[PDB]
Amino acid sequence: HETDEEFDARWVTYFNKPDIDAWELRKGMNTLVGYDLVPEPKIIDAALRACRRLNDFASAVRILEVVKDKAGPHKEIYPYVIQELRPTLNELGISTPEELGLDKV
Amino acid sequence: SVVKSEDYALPSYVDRRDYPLPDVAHVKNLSASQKALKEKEKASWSSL
Amino acid sequence: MAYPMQLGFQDATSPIMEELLHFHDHTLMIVFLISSLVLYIISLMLTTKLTHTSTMDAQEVETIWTILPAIILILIALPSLRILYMMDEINNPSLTVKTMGHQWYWSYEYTDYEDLSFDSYMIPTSELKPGELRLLEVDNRVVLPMEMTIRMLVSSEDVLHSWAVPSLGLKTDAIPGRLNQTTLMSSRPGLYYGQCSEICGSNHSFMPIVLELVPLKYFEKWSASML
Amino acid sequence: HQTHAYHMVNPSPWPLTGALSALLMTSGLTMWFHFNSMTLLMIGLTTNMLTMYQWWRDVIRESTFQGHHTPAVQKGLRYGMILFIISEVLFFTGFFWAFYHSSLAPTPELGGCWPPTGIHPLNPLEVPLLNTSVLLASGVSITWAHHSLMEGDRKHMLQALFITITLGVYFTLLQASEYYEAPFTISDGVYGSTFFVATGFHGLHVIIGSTFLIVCFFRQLKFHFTSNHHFGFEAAAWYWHFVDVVWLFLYVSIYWWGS
Amino acid sequence: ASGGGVPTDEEQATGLEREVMLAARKGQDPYNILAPKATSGTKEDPNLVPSITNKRIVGCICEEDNSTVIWFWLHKGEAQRCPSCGTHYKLVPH
Amino acid sequence: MFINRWLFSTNHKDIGTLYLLFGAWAGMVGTALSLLIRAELGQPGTLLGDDQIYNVVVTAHAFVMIFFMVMPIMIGGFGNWLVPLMIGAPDMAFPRMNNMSFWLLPPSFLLLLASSMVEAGAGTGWTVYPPLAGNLAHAGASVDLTIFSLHLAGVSSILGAINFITTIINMKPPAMSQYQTPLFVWSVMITAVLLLLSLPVLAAGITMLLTDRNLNTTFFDPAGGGDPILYQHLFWFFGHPEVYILILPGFGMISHIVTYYSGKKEPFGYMGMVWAMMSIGFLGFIVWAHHMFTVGMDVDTRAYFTSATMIIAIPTGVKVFSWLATLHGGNIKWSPAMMWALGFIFLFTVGGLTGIVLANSSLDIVLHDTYYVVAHFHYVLSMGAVFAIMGGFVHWFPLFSGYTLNDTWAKIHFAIMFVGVNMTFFPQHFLGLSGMPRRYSDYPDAYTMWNTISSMGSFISLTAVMLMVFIIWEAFASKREVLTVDLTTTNLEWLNGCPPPYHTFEEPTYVNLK
Amino acid sequence: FENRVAEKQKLFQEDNGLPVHLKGGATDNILYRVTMTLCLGGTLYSLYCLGWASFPHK
Amino acid sequence: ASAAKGDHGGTGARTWRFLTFGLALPSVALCTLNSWLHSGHRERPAFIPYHHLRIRTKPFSWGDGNHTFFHNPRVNPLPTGYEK
Ligand SMILES: CCCCCCCCCCCCCCCCCC(=O)OCC(COC(=O)CCCCCCCCCCCCCCCCC)OC(=O)CCCCCCCCCCCCCCCCC
Ligand code: HEA
Ligand SMILES: CCCCC/C=C\C/C=C\C/C=C\C/C=C\CCCC(=O)O[C@H](COC(=O)CCCCCCCCCCCCCCCCC)COP(=O)(O)OCCN
Ligand SMILES: CCCCCC/C=C\CCCCCCCCCC(=O)O[C@H](COC(=O)CCCCCCCCCCCCCCC)COP(=O)(O)OC[C@@H](O)CO
Ligand SMILES: CCCCCC/C=C\CCCCCCCCCC(=O)O[C@H](COC(=O)CCCCCCCCCCCCCCC)COP(=O)(O)OC[C@@H](O)CO
Ligand SMILES: C[C@H](CCC(=O)O)[C@H]1CC[C@H]2[C@@H]3[C@H](O)C[C@@H]4C[C@H](O)CC[C@]4(C)[C@H]3C[C@H](O)[C@]12C
Ligand SMILES: C[C@H](CCC(=O)O)[C@H]1CC[C@H]2[C@@H]3[C@H](O)C[C@@H]4C[C@H](O)CC[C@]4(C)[C@H]3C[C@H](O)[C@]12C
Ligand SMILES: C[C@H](CCC(=O)O)[C@H]1CC[C@H]2[C@@H]3[C@H](O)C[C@@H]4C[C@H](O)CC[C@]4(C)[C@H]3C[C@H](O)[C@]12C
Ligand code: CUA
Ligand SMILES: [Cu+2]
Ligand SMILES: [Mg+2]
Ligand code: NA
Ligand code: NA
Ligand SMILES: [Zn+2]
């Protein structure tokens, strides 16, 4: 309804709430993946740091999986997003699903 | 672990690519080593 | 008559039947197109892993998919109704023929001038002459003059029947106590077949109609000889 | 224990005995029409009356005696009765359609005219007009009964309901006499067919409606109704007005316009 | 002659009909005839959901005129949130 | 306890189970009758050597499939199980009258059996037109037993309609408006209104036929000034609403299935779906004489009925496109119920479009009383109703029973049926265009090829029906008990577990107004 | 007449587990058995009549 | 469209009883007069065996099969004419 930038900024603000709770983390990601888009890196960054404040490593990995899933057949999107997130992944010690072997069937 | 018919009114686990963060953990009961692992998770994940 | 493996209508014998063929072609093209478009859209919806499951606003698209079907219906209705009122338009017949349905045969009355009437029964399969058509031939055909507008009046002396000749585009129910009118004009000589078209009991399948279209002078002499 | 206001009904045999009574009445009519025998039909009529008696008895037990008819339950019964009446209206509509079809387009067999050649209709200004005044009057008196009940007046409710019932009986006796005296019969072509089947089903509904009013009369005598809670009475009155309105359409269509 | 003789509901209603009548006079709704009015639904001011047991189904019409109702069991204990709009509900048993 | 529970029931789930059992049994009878039709027609010549029996088989085929299989399954079975659960109600409004709607059906079916056993049967067509159905051309009890079978089925459904309308209007949570109730509930309410208004007219017409046959009335007999065509009007004034009654609950189940296996919380365009069902219901009362275009009707009346009939495509198209829009963006789960629903959308669309062909009265002169009509309605009615029923049955079997089907077997079953019904009915278009009449026990030789294929098709569907019974047996034989069901936040009927307890919603749901 | 509804309310609310169609007492049971006997007996008789009518003697 | 009467203020039992005795029952009494006054048998017409009347396609399931259910020998002829 608003501009892309305004949408992304609402979502960044949502995940950046310092005392965001577990229910709000899940509600956010489960609502976000309903939209026709792959979330911008800046949104995913804010969600991963929410995971960190909630001491939830597993949900951070899961969020990276759902970015890949939302891209569908556009195989170029997920590697781009991981690229943009590598400073955050390194800072927070978040391994990707591929690094964990969780992309094997 | 073990899901019971008599649990139908409680929040449940599901694996659905459109519901990435389910309402409960897959495993709720933790062994001693699994408890220690959840404590370690409170420190830097680079050390996991 | 129909021929083996036929897919569509019998070839037109009358100008109205020719109208119906072109109108059916028009309508079936629309039918094919809509069916194919739905099948295709179904497959398009079902062939992507991309998702969008949040609420979708409907009012904009519902305009398209009410207005476009309404336009299509009007494109069918206009030629449909034109043919309907053509078929109805006055034509001044030269001849009136009655047919009465019965269990299980047709009788025919040609009483414009003389008292001519006779019964018309299916030829039993065991008595077909070689080359004749099973369940379609009759003993006494409905001889009629070709290239002339004929009024057929249809009734019944027992249960409902229905007098049909597909290649002339004709089907008029035969109702006791009622005299239904239809008109008939064959562009060609020949033999044109139909079958009883309202269930009338145990030999409904076995009371066919055979029109024999010939030049007027042959029809006149035939008529005289049938008195 | 429930915390909604609706009625969970005890398991009951009457649906089954009612369904079987329907089997016995219909197979009984078949036996009567084709095998010259009334036996099955009499059993079916008997089991049908027993079913209706015990079923509606139980509804009174559930409501007056056990208290299950909360306002939500009563509201459902109001809808149910209105819908039942609508279905009966459409049943009569089929017979009016038959009557107008045949009378607006009289066929040659009739003489091409309506009334048919050889049919001498009743004079609509004699007993038919009297029957009209009787049912209209009964619609006034049942309205008096209804207001007396709402105002808590036992004696005048009973008096008005008795007058209403007496008028229903008067109509029925008059109609029976008219049937006997009529010079035409049900076998007198489509005139007799439409006349007797349509007025005949109407007369059956008058008898049904009168029976229902009589049930209400005896329940009133037994103090079942309160000044605010009396849906059986309301339902009987709605049904009674339906019977009155169907009569007015019959009178105008078949007796007057069709004469 | 305006006489009497017809029982009133006060006199003669019985059973559940009488329970509903008596509770209505007290402004109470133990048999759920009325729609409850929402609170603001915050964690501080949750919708209070009466129950005679330790769980009850909530339907949440998240926004006025939504045709989709969101259904879930509400259990005794800490307030729970509608999975669609987040508004809070707390069970008040027994 | 057994008799109390199953003969004296006042429970909407148990009565729904009774209806599903009754409808499944009737479906076997109806299928066997359909195989006899197609065996008679599977090669030229005569198989039964008795066309009165042929006509009896055809007639009973239709009555069984319509009145004893589709309506009991859709309305009595899915309606009773699902409608109270979908609105959080504790049962139906009239739980004891509901049981009589059920128990009138075995006697109704018994009367129809009786009709076929006495004399030479009612070989009339399911339309039962006079004078063929009158007391000279069908002397004896068969047609009267048929009339009485319809009377009992009619009372059954009228009282059921009263029950459903009352339940749906009166027993929702107080906060839930009609525009907060699920589409399947809407579809049942609208079907019930159609039943309420249409069946009394049929009852009137068949009662007039009964009195013409037995009391010397002449409603339909020209000798008394009557008219066979009046019966046709009364019959089809019911019979067109009836075909919408047969599909509307199907539309409702399709909406739920498509929504569910698309992973959606709601169907696309809910108010448009309500509008479309109401519009279809209303227009369904003003089109009946398109069953009568060859009876001798004035041209202006033909023009009106042509036009009014075509308009029904507009709301129907909104439903078809909204189902497509529900799939759009879905997380598609390729469950067997989804396959049934997708097959429904396509085959219903084909049959609806041949119905638009037939609505053109000029073309209907040549197509009326031919196999083109038979092909139209076995797409839109026979496949439409059967595919929605199978979709609903596969989808909700775990709710009703507590057990899961084998999904692989269920997908095999779908595949076999889809091939079978298309092989059976698609060639009947060619037979109709080329002039083969319906209600025939044999055909001119030219028509052999397509009748042969059609009959071979009918045996493939027979194999599917046999496999269906084995699949239900295997589920109850293996006893895989349901654990979790997704999307319960938008499918309230699942939220009390599988199967739900005998009493549900003893404490009603909490829904506030805000 | 006197209003004896309270008495009937006591009777039909007695905590005796009886279903409402039997809760009036022994007479209910008699009328129930008569009805059900007529229905089941009549239904058997109708099946006999179908059997008879299913075969030629017309 | 409300007749020439005219008496509300809060409708009630008293007004509907007034209507019952002051209008409804007097009307019945008047129509009862008018009827049982135009009564007395009329001249039954010549019998003509019209084929659209006295229909018999199947015997009636009572009596001798040839008498309608409320047959009145004075005014209802059989297909062969009036009875003795
Ligand atoms: C539609 C349901 C599924 C169908 C399943 C079977 C598929 C059938 C085709 C699947 C393709 C569908 C159309 C096939 C028409 C083939 C013949 C024709 O052109 O017929 C035209 C007329 C006759 O007109 C004429 O006078 C011209 C005759 C020309 C003769 C030339 C020689 C042709 C050789 C013989 C052909 C053998 C026929 C096959 C015999 C078929 C036996 C089963 O017939 C007719 O009207 C038939 C009336 C059918 C109306 C229902 C519409 C269904 C639409 C389905 C579209 C979805 C996309 C397809 C994609 C569909 C895939 C799902
Ligand atoms: C499920 C049952 C069902 C349904 C829903 C329908 C739906 C329709 N039917 Fe059919 N019909 C029958 C069951 C049904 N019918 C039966 C049993 C008979 C014969 C009875 C007998 O004689 O025994 C019959 C007979 C029958 C006749 C009489 C034919 C004859 O006997 O000569 C006609 C004539 O107009 C007709 C027309 C239609 C039309 C226009 C619809 C419409 O409602 C269809 C609307 C649907 C669509 C059009 C497809 C989806 C729409 C879009 C994708 C939008 C875009 C489309 C366009 C612009 C056209 N039907
Ligand atoms: C005070 C007015 C009378 C009240 C009612 C009297 C009896 C009617 C019974 C109810 C049935 C109503 C309609 C039945 C059809 C015919 C009855 C019409 C009314 C009537 O009573 O008609 C009489 C003939 O009755 C006859 O044939 C035969 C009468 C007996 C046979 C009844 C046949 C049963 C028909 C079954 C109906 C099925 C209904 C199904 C509804 C299902 C709805 C979902 C007329 O007598 P007549 O000697 O011809 O002429 C008078 C000459 N002096
Ligand atoms: C061959 C002959 C066969 C046919 C013979 C038919 C004979 C006659 C049947 C006459 C109908 C009698 C109906 C009596 C119903 C009594 C039960 C009753 O009236 O029950 C009431 C509920 O209404 C309710 O169910 C309302 C239920 C009413 C339904 C009745 C509608 C009439 C149906 C008749 C059948 C139609 C046949 C049509 C044929 C074409 C009880 O609630 P209340 O009154 O509020 O009381 C409670 C207060 O006391 C608390 O203070
Ligand atoms: C050819 C001859 C064929 C003969 C066929 C005969 C067929 C059937 C035999 C009928 C046996 C009837 C037995 C009595 C049925 C009474 C039903 C009734 O009265 O049903 C009521 C609901 O219907 C309501 O109100 C409103 C509805 C009342 C309907 C009463 C019964 C009508 C039966 C005939 C209807 C025909 C329709 C005619 C128009 C086409 C009460 O519902 P329950 O669930 O019981 O209780 C609910 C509790 O809360 C009550 O305390
Ligand atoms: C007004 C009503 C309800 C809206 C609501 O309160 O939510 C809506 C629901 C369905 C709508 C209709 C359907 O979408 C179908 C038609 C679509 C056309 O674009 C306008 C007319 C059209 C006939 C619509 C008129 C109107 O907007 C309707 C009738
Ligand atoms: C079909 C029915 C007559 C049934 C009968 O013969 O009993 C008649 C009665 C009223 C008719 C309608 C009314 O005459 C009004 C319209 C007149 C128009 O010329 C045709 C459509 C039109 C809408 C008619 C269609 C049809 O002929 C109707 C509905
Ligand atoms: C006995 C009873 C008194 C009230 C009560 O029981 O306390 C009275 C009051 C109203 C009376 C009825 C009404 O006056 C109406 C009827 C009048 C008739 O003249 C006698 C019977 C009739 C049906 C009366 C019978 C009986 O005397 C009733 C029923
Ligand atoms: Cu004659 Cu069919
Ligand atoms: Cu139709
Ligand atoms: Mg026909
Ligand atoms: Na009142
Ligand atoms: Na054959
Ligand atoms: Zn919410």
Token pair listed for C96? 């009136």
Bridge-based pairing state of the strands C105-110 and C150-156: unpaired
Which of E56, E66, E64 lies closest to E89 in space, CA to CA?
E56
Token pair listed for F505? 């919603």
Cα D2 from chain centroid (whole Å): 37
Q: Kind and range of the H or E element at E56?
A: strand E55-60
Q: Kind and range of the H or E element at D244?
A: helix D231-250
- Cβ contact C1:F444 at 8 Å: yes
Active-site annotation holds for F151: no
Q: How far apart are CA F244 and CA F70, in angstroms?
A: 12
Kindly give, in sequence order, each residue whose CB lies less than 8 Å from that of residue A60, ignoring residues fewer than 6 positions away.
Answer: A48, A51, A52, A92, A94
Q: Which residues of F403-432 are buried (b: 16+ CB within 10 A; e: fewer)?
A: bbbeeebbbebbebbbebbbbbbbbbbbbb
Chain D residues inside the 8 Å CB shell of E8? 152, 226-228
Q: Where are the alpha helices (DSSP H) in chain C?
A: 15-45, 59-88, 216-225
- With an 8 Å Cβ cutoff, are B5 and F331 in contact? no
Q: How far apart are CA D193 and CA F215, in angstroms?
A: 9
Of F88, F174, F488, the CB nearest to E34: F174
Kindly give, in sequence order, each residue whose CB lies less than 8 Å from that of residue D211, ignoring residues fewer than 6 positions away.
Answer: none
Q: How far apart are CA F265 and CA A31, in angstroms?
A: 12
Beta strands in F261-309 (DSSP E): none
Of D19, D30, D102, the CB nearest to F145: D30
Q: How far apart are CA F87 and CA F246, in angstroms?
A: 23
Which of E34, G12, E18 lies closest to D228 in space, CA to CA?
E18
Strands in C208-214's sheet, in edge-to-edge order, are: C142-145, C208-214, C190-195
The alpha-carbon gap from F328 to the nearest alpha carbon of chain C, in Å, equals 5
* CA distance from start to end of chain G: 59
Q: How far apart are CA F435 and CA D238, in angstroms?
A: 54
- Cβ contact C94:C149 at 8 Å: yes
Query: Residue H4 class from Cβ within 10 Å (0-12 exposed, 13-18 middle, 19+ buried)?
Result: exposed
- With an 8 Å Cβ cutoff, are F490 and E70 in contact? yes
CA dihedral (F13, F19, F20, F23) in degrees, to 10, reads -170
Q: How far apart are CA F219 and CA D98, in angstroms?
A: 7
Fold designation for C2-91: Helix Hairpins (1.10.287)
The total number of residues shown for chain A amounts to 105
Phi, psi of C126 (to 5 degrees): -70, -15
Token pair listed for A70? 């939302």
Classified as helix, coil or strand, B42 is coil
For the CA of F298, the closest atom of ligand 7 is: 27
Q: What is the 3-state secondary structure of F373-411?
A: HHHHHHHHHHHHHHHHHHHHHHHHHHHHHCECCCHHHHH
User: What are the residue ranges spanned by the domains of chain E?
Assistant: 1-94
Active-site annotation holds for F233: no
By the CB < 8 Å criterion, does D112 face chain H? Answer: no
Chain C residues inside the 8 Å CB shell of D108? 177
Query: Residue A75 class from Cβ within 10 Å (0-12 exposed, 13-18 middle, 19+ buried)?
Result: exposed
Bridge-based pairing state of the strands F510-511 and E55-60: parallel
Q: Please give the resolution of this entry in Å, rounded to 1 decimal.
A: 1.7
Which of C91, C116, C184, C106 lies closest to C145 in space, CA to CA?
C184
Q: Kind and range of the H or E element at C214?
A: strand C208-214
Find chains touching chain F: ≥3 CB pairs under 8 Å: B, C, D, E, G, H
Active-site annotation holds for F244: yes
Query: Residue F105 class from Cβ within 10 Å (0-12 exposed, 13-18 middle, 19+ buried)?
Result: buried
Q: How far is the CA of F129 from the centre of ligand 9 (A)?
A: 13
Owner of token pair 């009925």: F305
Q: How far apart are CA D73 and CA G26, in angstroms?
A: 29
Q: How far apart are CA C77 and CA C80, in angstroms?
A: 5
Which residues have CB under 6 Å of ligand 5? D 7, 9, 18, 21-22, 25-26, 48, 51-52, 55, 59, 62-63, 68, 73, 77, 80-81, 84, 87-88, 91; F 94-97, 148, 151, 155, 158, 162, 200, 203
User: What are the residue ranges spanned by the domains of chain C?
Assistant: 2-91, 92-227
The total of other beta-carbon atoms located within 10 Å of residue F345's CB is: 21
Classified as helix, coil or strand, E69 is coil
The residues with which C152 forms a beta bridge, in sequence order, are: C97, C182
Strands in C105-110's sheet, in edge-to-edge order, are: C116-120, C105-110, C95-102, C150-156, C180-184
Classified as helix, coil or strand, F115 is helix
Token pair listed for C182? 């239809």
Which of D10, D15, D151, D6 lies closest to D74 in space, CA to CA?
D6
Rounded to 5°, the CA angle C51-C54-C58 comes to 105
Which residues have CB under 6 Å of ligand 7? D 101; F 230, 233, 289, 300-301, 304
The total number of residues shown for chain D amounts to 259
Which residues have CB under 6 Å of ligand 3? D 29, 91, 172, 175-176, 179-180, 182, 185-186, 196-197, 200-201, 203-204; F 151, 154-155, 158, 203, 207, 211, 215; H 68-72, 76
* CA distance from start to end of chain H: 54
Q: Which residues of C179-212 are buried (b: 16+ CB within 10 A; e: fewer)?
A: ebebbbbbeeeeebbbbbbbbbbbebbbbbbbbb
Gyration radius from chain F CA atoms: 23
Alpha carbon distances (Å) from A28 to A20, B26, F251, F405? 10, 20, 34, 35
The alpha-carbon gap from E92 to the nearest alpha carbon of chain D, in Å, equals 15
Active-site annotation holds for F413: no
Cα C87 from chain centroid (whole Å): 13
Token pair listed for F419? 């091939």
- Cβ contact A57:A94 at 8 Å: yes
Alpha carbon distances (Å) from D65 to D223, E9, F96, G30? 11, 13, 18, 21
- Cβ contact D247:D93 at 8 Å: no
What residues make up the domain containing F446?
Answer: 2-514
- CATH label of the domain that carries residue F154: 1.20.210.10
8-state DSSP, C212: E
Q: How far apart are CA F146 and CA F419, in angstroms?
A: 34
Alpha carbon distances (Å) from A37 to A41, A84, C193, F381? 12, 17, 65, 41
Which of C196, D62, D71, D15 lies closest to F51 in space, CA to CA?
C196
Q: What is the amino acid identity at position G11?
A: L
- Cβ contact F267:E67 at 8 Å: no
The total number of residues shown for chain E amounts to 94
Alpha carbon distances (Å) from C174 to C153, F236, F297, F491, H51? 9, 19, 13, 54, 22
Owner of token pair 């295709």: C40
Q: What is the amino acid identity at position F226?
A: G
The residues with which C143 forms a beta bridge, in sequence order, are: C212
For the CA of D59, the closest atom of ligand 5 is: 51
- With an 8 Å Cβ cutoff, are A62 and B20 in contact? yes
Which residue among the candidates F12, F19, F59, F91 is catalytic per the annotation? F91
The total of other beta-carbon atoms located within 10 Å of residue F188's CB is: 28
Active-site annotation holds for F291: yes
Q: Which residues of D113-141 are buried (b: 16+ CB within 10 A; e: fewer)?
A: ebbbbbbebbebebbbbbbbbbbbbbbbb
Phi, psi of C154 (to 5 degrees): -125, 130
The residues with which E91 forms a beta bridge, in sequence order, are: E49
Chain D residues inside the 8 Å CB shell of C177? 107-109
Q: How far apart are CA C96 and CA C149, in angstroms?
A: 9
Strands in E47-51's sheet, in edge-to-edge order, are: E47-51, E88-93, E80-81
The residues with which C107 forms a beta bridge, in sequence order, are: C100, C119
Alpha carbon distances (Å) from D115 to B16, C210, F452? 76, 43, 56
Q: How far is the CA of F217 from the centre of ligand 1 (A)?
A: 49
Gyration radius from chain A CA atoms: 13
Which of D102, D33, D25, D36 lies closest to F135 in space, CA to CA?
D33
- Cβ contact F482:F404 at 8 Å: yes
The total number of residues shown for chain G amounts to 58
What is C92-227's CATH number, 1.20.1050.140, 1.10.357.10, 3.40.50.1240, 2.60.40.420? 2.60.40.420
The total number of residues shown for chain F amounts to 514
- Cβ contact G5:D222 at 8 Å: yes
Q: Which residues of F150-167 are buried (b: 16+ CB within 10 A; e: fewer)?
A: bbbbbbbbbbbbbbbbbb
Q: How far apart are CA F327 and CA F338, in angstroms?
A: 10
CA dihedral (D213, D219, D224, D228) in degrees, to 10, reads 10
